[PDB]
Amino acid sequence: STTVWTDGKDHLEKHLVENLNCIRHYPEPDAGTLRQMLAKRNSVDNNAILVTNGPTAAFYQIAQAFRGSRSLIAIPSFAEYEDACRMYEHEVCFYPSNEDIGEADFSNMDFCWLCNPNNPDGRLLQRTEILRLLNDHPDTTFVLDQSYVSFTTEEVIRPADIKGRKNLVMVYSFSHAYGIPGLRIGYIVANKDFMKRVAAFSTPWAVNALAIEAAKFILIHPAQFTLPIRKWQRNTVDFITALNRLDGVEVHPSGTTFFLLRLKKGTAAELKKNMLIRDASNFRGLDESYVRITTQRPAQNQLFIKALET
Amino acid sequence: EIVNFSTTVWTDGDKDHLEKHLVENLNCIRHYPEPDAGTLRQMLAKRNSVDNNAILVTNGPTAAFYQIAQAFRGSRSLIAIPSFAEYEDACRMYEHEVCFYPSNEDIGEADFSNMDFCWLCNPNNPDGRLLQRTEILRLLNDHPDTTFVLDQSYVSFTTEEVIRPADIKGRKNLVMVYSFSHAYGIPGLRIGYIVANKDFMKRVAAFSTPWAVNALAIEAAKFILIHPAQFTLPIRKWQRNTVDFITALNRLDGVEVHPSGTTFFLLRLKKGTAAELKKYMLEEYNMLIRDASNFRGLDESYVRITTQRPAQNQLFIKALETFLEK
């Protein structure tokens, strides 16, 4: 149902419980101290981080800073790239995430919005296929949804890749990798002329005090919040082979731990009517036959096959 | 260990039970909140005698000021000063043409001719200026073509009769912005809300972003709403400690306290600066005060002070007296 790494404990929660009084005071209007910690950690400049009320808020603030830009959006994809581009009167062009991104026409594209690995495709672009996009189309700025940068092993572009570039902008998330969608925190990494344009629309105290406290704890404790990614995909591999062999159901490949699956007969809404699943009908480029599915833990996997078979 | 005189937040509330409640429902951080905070919205509407259509939960009351400014980028705004700097910042960010006007002169008698918005806060930060529920009603009535945006953050920091959410009814030119930060000591949770008639409300909804209100905040608010008594503020006792505080302050020589209708107030140094005063009180006496210099319409002689406990107030008077003699 959700693209959130969920089987992660009370060591972050003990911390929050101990520091609950932080809700009695204003956060830095700036989340300025977290910003600095993220900058030094990510080996990027201080003025190249901007802490945001969740990864979603960040997409909206980027759209807004460049109203009337022309945007290229790979579909199917997170609906928010599109809603944000529309709220700010971008002319939006679509392009299939299953066609090679390189063969798309960037001639008149100010922005290209990628998520990689992609939601829901799981489509995964090599770290190298992207570095050359950035080189071949300098007049296009690539907004890379980095939400699932952790849900894979093959190398990724990272924040320090902004250096000697101007057409790379990144959005990081705390909801997915660390299991805290309810806290609403993320951040933008960008070269500093772009960030200046983004910053003009920052509002004070947009990032809540618990979220900042939680983010600081996650940073002072790398090892405690490392996603067991190897183990995760290996389980999805097993979960899908067990799905392909079923009949009247085929599973579109993925580069990560969630993936789409298609019904030959039978509707998403109906297969949705105590396990939750994502009816993928509401992505552009997917019809009623499609659902997104996130790889859980063996027992509950091997027990999905069954409730479906029937 | 530091005593805080610099915030307009009610700090002495009973929070053990609110806080125990968040500890119990801490798992809410693991799931998206309603994108909409729709259940909170629903319970606010009912509590406030208003339609579901007329509330919009926001990421703090500040967020609401900006979302309103945004929805009306063209607009001309009349802002009373001094006031919360955020009305101004909002209006600027969204390129409003901004007219100023003195809060302690009668706003009922300013120039509303081509004003699309008028921004008030009652009782006012930092002044404590308080308009009668009645003075406000004739403004709403006399100027149909000005939307009045009424910061209600401090609506409970007064004994007097206030405008309330159910005033939007049969009235299109009233908008309220409510707050959970001030009355309930939870500024760090970032939660507040808009009350407006639904024609206005839909101009602002057009810029709403999902999951803008975080989960724990939704949860704190739900708890406060279910327990009106528990979170009721002791306003008579605070107001009255404020009188004993202001009286002692005026007796001091070299300082003047601007009259106030609520539990915080401006004081003016005859000589010395706010920066000077604030550093001393902090370093010498472990007390924090608000340098009010950065308010439009005040210079470096002004500080904002919120009444703390009597014993702390008493001890702040010596702290100050000691300053003056230097």
From TrEMBL, chain B:
Pfam families: Aminotran_1_2
GO molecular function: pyridoxal phosphate binding
Keyword vocabulary terms for this entry: Pyridoxal phosphate
Cofactors that this protein relies on: pyridoxal 5'-phosphate
The UniProt record lists the keyword Protein biosynthesis: no
Domain Aminotransferase class I/classII large stretches: 30-319
Protein name: L-threonine-O-3-phosphate decarboxylase, putative
Organism taxonomic ancestry: Bacteria, Pseudomonadati, Bacteroidota, Bacteroidia, Bacteroidales
